[model samples]
Target: HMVKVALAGCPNVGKTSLFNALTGTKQYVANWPGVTVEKKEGVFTYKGYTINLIDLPGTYSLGYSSIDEKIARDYLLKGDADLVILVADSVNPEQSLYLLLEILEMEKKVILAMTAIDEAKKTGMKIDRYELQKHLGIPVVFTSSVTGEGLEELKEKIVEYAQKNTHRMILDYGEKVESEIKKVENFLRDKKLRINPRYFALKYLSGDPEFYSEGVKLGLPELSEEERIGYRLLIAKRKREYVENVVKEAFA
Candidate 1:
């Protein structure tokens, strides 16, 4: 059995750098024509399983914009992907959380790599790996392309999960969000969206203009609740980080 690993994340997260390190190939920097997504895959033996590495487009949020996001989502949802390796900048984890949340909904075995630890540190960013592991319930390693620190440990952890057939379902949104979700839930009865229903629902709520999501419209005014502690939006609000403290109130 091959352990198929897909690399994806927000742009500038050093996703290409990590791909180069792991595969010893310059998968990134490969020229692409204007406005087209690029992907390259290679096979390498790891822990007795032939690991197929697929490097997809670096996308910020598969939800909002960019062809890159659509490419990443199509492969994960409709392609035969077995695992996901989310490469992110530890210093700027907030932007990446939304992607992580979407990936979590996919229910594929996943591992996280924090690239450019050196850069984050030079900028005084301290990522609490323990806190993240506790929060995410998955194996995550702080990896640096500069020092080659934690790369091998990341590989080791992936192999461990590979053997365990690591994949689990995602937690739902607030009770209100989930409750609103059920009425039209049968629409996604298509197997394609099975990997991630909550994401499908939210994207449906956000409403793509064509609105492929259909089963009778569920009007918004979604139920509201306090952001859980340590959640990215909450962190931003509690720090008074933004000029306006509308984090919880806008939707409330």
Candidate 2:
């Protein structure tokens, strides 16, 4: 079977750089913020195996509100991808922490691919991968796209990830909120929304627009058929007013 890997992480985390180095192709490169935009994607062959790589639009959070979130999250949940290569810049590792925390809650097992090691080294920064792995609680490794380090090892891990157990989501939003989430999750019924029903409930309860768009897409694929339609809607969904419900329900 062909192995599909969805690459996610924060914006400018050197995901593109690492992707070029690993896949050795010039995928589309553009910078814009719109729902489910046409993100980068390419295919590369390694050791007689074909690898399908999806370079998702750089996002700041793992939470769903935009097209990127819906597409990216749904792809992870339903695409049957072998692994998710979460690329994070070493220099700004914490920048993606909140997003990473969201991924940590996902049911998918992912590989944390730390990129831009050279930049960290240039700044005299020391990133202990093993230590960082403890914080992330995922299979972790380092990469310097410039130096081509960890390319092979990551490939092996990508294969291993398919066999790894799923990561459990145990986020804290206080007992009352968590209990509310449980209630919403059980009641929000979809025989086919493949991701965690509770997670959907949480996003929906939060009044997340992106999730609403996703619901439309999930419920009606022909509408938001591509990345552009999906991403644009996601951005529109993330308005503060739209996300107020979840905050009020879960945190406020």
Candidate 3:
């Protein structure tokens, strides 16, 4: 039996290096059918199990905005891979993190890999892997092709996540955005659409070109005080972090 894993990330996030490290000389490359979007596949045996890896084309957003983006999104949505490896550069990970959040809305299995820790250190930046895992609710690991650090651990983590399906990030995108997102969700629920509600919700909030209904087509709607009240739960979670640090520093 072979487990399928997809490597996905924005361009220049060391995705190429990670693929090379994992596949060595066993990779096969081809263009997607009738399209120039590159497709790379490889196979390896890890811990008595065979692994099949797919390298998705690098794209900033998979909102059907480009050929590569559409290809990657279509592959994932169609269940081409069992799990997705989201690679992020350790230094300045804001953009990569945003992509990760967007992927999370798809409700698929994902593992977070942080690359370039060595380079980030030279620039006086440190990424706390445990903190990131805790915050994002996923398995976060640092992998360096230069040092071979976390390679075996990454393999093991991938297998474990594949079997257990135990990690995800539920991000709170603030009240104004969330309330609008919920309206789209309710629309899906009422219509019983066979789609990831969160994906459509985010797309609607972001004003994806496709989302349109009489309510949304007419104009933007303002959230009421009742809708605003729901914001407190997520706000409280963020505030507690500051409070904890303050108390720790005060006691120290």
> Which candidate has the top score in lDDT?
3
* Worst window of 10 by summed lDDT in candidate 1: 243-252
Which 10-residue window in model 2 sums to the lowest lDDT?
243-252
lDDT of 3 by residue, 1-252 (tens): 578999989988988888888888899887788987778888877889788988999977666667888788878777578889999877657557767766776888889998876787678765667677666667888888777888888999888878883533365566776676677677667554444777665654444444333235545453344543444334334434543442333222
Off by over 4 Å in 2: 26-36, 62-71, 77-80, 188-192, 210-252
Better of 1 and 3 by TM-score: 3
Ranking by lDDT: 3, 2, 1
Off by over 4 Å in 1: 26-36, 167-175, 186-196, 209-252
Candidate lDDT values, in order: 0.63, 0.65, 0.71
Query: Candidates' TM-scores?
Result: 0.73, 0.72, 0.78
Kindly list the per-residue Cα lDDT of model 1 for residues 1-252, writing each as its tens digit. 677788888888888788777777524444234554566776666567577778878776664355776678777777776678989777666556556656776676778787888887788655667666666667778898888888778777766777784434445455655665564365555545344555555555545322223422333333223322223243233223321222222111
Candidate 2 on 1-252: residue-level lDDT in tens?
Answer: 488888987778888888888778535554224543776777776666677788877787655557666666656666766777888777766555446556655656778887877787788876666665654568888889998888888887876666555446444455655675676565556456657776665555444566655644554222333543443344334332323432233221
- Cα distance off (Å), candidate 3, residue 190: 4.7
Lowest lDDT 10-residue stretch of candidate 3 = 243-252
- Model 3 segments beyond 4 Å from truth? 165-169, 190-194, 209-252
Error of 2 at 70 (Å): 4.7
